[PDB]
Amino acid sequence: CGSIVPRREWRALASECRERLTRPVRYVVVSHTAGSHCDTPASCAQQAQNVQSYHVRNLGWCDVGYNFLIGEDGLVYEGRGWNIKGAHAGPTWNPISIGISFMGNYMNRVPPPRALRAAQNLLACGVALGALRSNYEVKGHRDVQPTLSPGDRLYEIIQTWSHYRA
Amino acid sequence: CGSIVPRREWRALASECRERLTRPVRYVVVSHTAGSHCDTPASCAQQAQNVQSYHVRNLGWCDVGYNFLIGEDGLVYEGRGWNIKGAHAGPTWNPISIGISFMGNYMNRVPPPRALRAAQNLLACGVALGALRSNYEVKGHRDVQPTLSPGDRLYEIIQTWSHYRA
Amino acid sequence: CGSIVPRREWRALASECRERLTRPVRYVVVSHTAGSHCDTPASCAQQAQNVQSYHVRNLGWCDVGYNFLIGEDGLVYEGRGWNIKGAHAGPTWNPISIGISFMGNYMNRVPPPRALRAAQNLLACGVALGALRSNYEVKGHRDVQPTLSPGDRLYEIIQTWSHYRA
Amino acid sequence: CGSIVPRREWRALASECRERLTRPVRYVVVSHTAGSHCDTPASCAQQAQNVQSYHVRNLGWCDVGYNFLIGEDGLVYEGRGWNIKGAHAGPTWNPISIGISFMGNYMNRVPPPRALRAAQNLLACGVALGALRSNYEVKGHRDVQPTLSPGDRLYEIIQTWSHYRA
């Protein structure tokens, strides 16, 4: 499912993580990187590679902090995966939720449909694989931590989502 | 299911096709367009147009000839869709089969992983929807017509698929 | 040749099968159905209706698997016929054989002599048309797949035939 | 898990098969051998020799067809095992399944409780080994192939199971 871009396909550094998730998982956290945005597979690969580099080389972590990244090229970029605990929402949230992030600042712009599809397509692919539980619940980043993520424009959009719950 | 690019989004001429396919469909025929390859959501939307254009405007079909198209961008472009009859492998095979075409000439080139993932993941969405038989059979275009389609390289890769019977 | 009962006469569902045998075929493979038997054309047409139904409804196949079916009514029923490959004895033998089945279970019964005649003649006819080699070889279902088919009593018998090869 | 009579111990011929399954496997096809049955370690180790002999001497195969076998003595016998592709349910299911095979004929006859535990256990093992999926599906041989296997009484039983799915 999900037509996800493998970690090795974006030249991603070998994860060093261990902590697993209590799947089937209940919560989902939509963030934004707030970095540079990309719209081509070649440019979007370089960007998740770049997000990782900052989380691993500089911030110290075992792997890129999100479970999955969504590019404006329409493709879902693999981070920690369906099983390995996140690093996106704080210690209350990281072990009970798959975090996903859109590549770009979405304060004063919206993400293309092809990403928002790819986002939903993924979440379905979650249930399908069994990592998400059938009636998964979706939160914005600002719901669960003091933060301007996931961007003013993207925030409203995910509020009107089938599986959303405030 | 699926991250399929809908017709609106690639700017497609409205279909005048009404003839249907009896669900569930048994077969799937893999072709190439033997044309210019694209590899960005934008450039691949234009390629979808160019193909359909040649099909409606020159050959005089009700729509683009294929049911779906696969881009080297890693996206599925919607054509005649799941329920409508195609025009991609002559008249014995057209009424009993879904035709998918990779956008390119694959005689000396391979489609990248993401093309092949999107196609395969589509077929699974087909199965899941009940539009394909769960025991569907993938055929080469050159198996069911005397063509070079879907190109020597791509032909080899579809042969390795779970569901390939010649 | 042929006093074979055609498909339309026993009220067959239409074959979705399309792959073709090379003529002249070299091998014939004798199976039984291991089901109930029949001795009227009104039951032996119902029987082949039910045998096809098993294969197309439950197994989800394209058509009844056998190329023809021999009834104890004394008549041959047209399955896939001479030209379409059967799904009767696995994928080595299927494309180099005609597979005929006796509607009944011949573990604890011989097929009545009219049913034997029916089968023997079918082959005779076959050779005349060019659909079998003049020196075709007969196997039993157990000789090429692990099965009790065509039944002990019927296996005894077919071992006596001119064209048999152990 | 454990407690499986190895090939060496029932005195199998050297396997020549090379084609491997992909783990974890989804489907399990219960069959029967259809012949006479055993209820002692030495009678059953003989039984499996009789069987393999047939499949390797008479049918010219690389090895015994079934991935495993289940004597009424209470013990599992190694076949092709978890990692090698079977030859027990046609070119369709053989590459996506584990073929277990009760030794006997179970048309009017149940296997004894200890043969049913031997099998139920072998599967949990396979799950715990990551050889099978945790949501594996248990098909009858008759559910996927034209046959009476695994016998009208054993089939009745397998239908009751947690992981049965026609």
Query: What would the 3-class secondary structure string for C89-120 be?
Result: CHHHHHHHEEEEEECCCCCCCCCCHHHHHHHH
Q: Which amino acid is at A38?
A: C
Phi/psi at C76 (nearest 5 deg)?
-95, 140
In 3D, which of C42, C47, C114 has the Cα closest to residue C79? C47
Distances (CA, A) of B86 to B125, C15, C56, D130: 18, 21, 25, 42
How do A76-78 and A25-32 pair as beta strands?
unpaired
CA dist., res. A63 & res. A15, Å (int) = 5
In 3D, which of A50, A53, A56 has the Cα closest to residue A37? A50
Which residues of chain C are within 8 Å of residue B26 when distances are taken between CB atoms?
Answer: 16, 62
Residues B138, B130 contacting (CB under 8 angstroms): no
Phi/psi at A67 (nearest 5 deg)?
-75, -45
How do A132-140 and A25-32 pair as beta strands?
parallel
Task: For Cα atoms C147, D148, C65, give the angle at the middle one, nearest 5 degrees.
Answer: 75
Task: For Cα atoms A38, A44, A50, give the angle at the middle one, nearest 5 degrees.
Answer: 100
Q: How many domains does chain A have?
A: 1
Residue of C nearest to D150 (CA): C147
Residue D38: helix, strand or coil by DSSP?
Answer: coil
CA dist., res. D164 & res. A157, Å (int) = 42
DSSP 8-state assignment for residue D165: -
Closest-CA distance, B28 to chain C, in angstroms, reads: 13
Residue D104: helix, strand or coil by DSSP?
Answer: coil
Residue C75: partners with Cβ closer than 8 Å, 6 or more residues away: C3, C4, C5, C41, C44, C118
The gap between the terminal CA atoms of chain D, to the nearest Å, is: 28
Structure solved via: X-ray
- How are strands ordered across the β-sheet holding D25-32? D4-5, D76-78, D68-70, D97-102, D25-32, D132-140
Which residues of chain B have a Cβ shorter than 8 Å from any chain D Cβ? Answer: 135, 162
Q: Which amino acid is at C98?
A: I
Distances (CA, A) of D28 to B10, B99, C16: 44, 32, 28
Resolution in A: 3.2
Closest-CA distance, D136 to chain B, in angstroms, reads: 16
CA dist., res. A111 & res. A105, Å (int) = 9
* Chains B & D: contacts with CB separation below 8 Å: 3
**D2-8, Cβ contacts within 8 angstroms, sequence gap of 24 or more:** D2/D125, D3/D75, D3/D76, D4/D68, D4/D75, D4/D76, D4/D77, D4/D78, D4/D122, D5/D41, D5/D44, D5/D45, D5/D75, D5/D76, D5/D77, D5/D78, D6/D78, D7/D78
Which residue reads 């017709």 in tokens? B7
3-state secondary structure chain B: CCCEECHHHHCCCCCCCCCECCCCEEEEEEEECCCCCCCCHHHHHHHHHHHHHHHHHHCCCCCCCCCEEECCCCCEEECCCCCECCCCCCCCCCCCEEEEEECCCCCCCCCCHHHHHHHHHHHHHHHHHCCEEEEEEEEEHHHHCCCCCCCHHHHHHHHCCCCECC
DSSP 8-state assignment for residue A153: H
CA dist., res. D118 & res. D72, Å (int) = 9
DSSP 8-state assignment for residue A60: -
Report the run of H or E that residue C42 belongs to, with start and end: helix C41-53
User: Which stretches of D1-112 are DSSP H helices?
Assistant: 7-10, 41-53, 90-93
Q: Is the sign of the CA dihedral B84, B87, B93, B95 positive or negative?
A: positive
Residue A32: partners with Cβ closer than 8 Å, 6 or more residues away: A101, A102, A103, A104, A105, A106, A141, A149, A150, A151, A154
Q: Is the sign of the CA dihedral D71, D76, D79, D82 positive or negative?
A: positive
Which residue reads 């692919």 in tokens? A125
Helix, strand, coil shares of chain D, percent, nearest 5, are 35, 20, 45
Phi/psi at D139 (nearest 5 deg)?
-100, 145
Residues B82, B126 contacting (CB under 8 angstroms): yes
Residue A136: partners with Cβ closer than 8 Å, 6 or more residues away: A25, A26, A27, A28, A123, A126, A127, A163
Q: Is the sign of the CA dihedral A76, A80, A83, A89 positive or negative?
A: negative
Q: Which amino acid is at D77?
A: Y
Half-sphere exposure at residue A36, Cβ-oriented, CA atoms within 13 angstroms: 13
CA dist., res. B97 & res. B67, Å (int) = 9
Does B135 sit within 8 Å of D92, measured CB to CB? Answer: yes
**B146-152, Cβ contacts within 8 angstroms, sequence gap of 24 or more:** B147/B31, B148/B34, B148/B107, B149/B31, B149/B32, B149/B34, B150/B30, B150/B31, B150/B32, B150/B101, B150/B102, B150/B106, B151/B32, B151/B34, B151/B104, B151/B105, B151/B106, B151/B107, B151/B109, B152/B106, B152/B107, B152/B108
Q: Which amino acid is at B116?
A: L
DSSP 8-state assignment for residue D9: H
> To probe the interface with B, which of D22, D92, D93 has the most B CB atoms within 10 Å?
D92
CA dist., res. A38 & res. A44, Å (int) = 5
Rg (CA), chain D: 14
Facing B121 at nearest CB: one of A1, A74, A113: A1
Phi/psi at A68 (nearest 5 deg)?
-140, 150
Residue D89: partners with Cβ closer than 8 Å, 6 or more residues away: D29, D31, D97, D99, D141, D144, D145
State yes or no: cis peptide before A113, omega within 30 of 0. no
CA dist., res. A135 & res. A140, Å (int) = 17
Rg (CA), chain A: 14
CA dist., res. B70 & res. B15, Å (int) = 19
CA dist., res. D166 & res. D157, Å (int) = 14
Q: Residue C80 belongs to a domain with what CATH number?
A: 3.40.80.10
* Chains B & C: contacts with CB separation below 8 Å: 8
Which residues of chain C have a Cβ shorter than 8 Å from any chain B Cβ? Answer: 16, 18-19, 60, 62
Domain range enclosing A35 = 1-166
Residues D44, D118 contacting (CB under 8 angstroms): no
The gap between the terminal CA atoms of chain A, to the nearest Å, is: 28
Residues C110, C157 contacting (CB under 8 angstroms): yes
Q: What is the dihedral of CA C92, C98, C103, C109, to 10 degrees?
A: -80
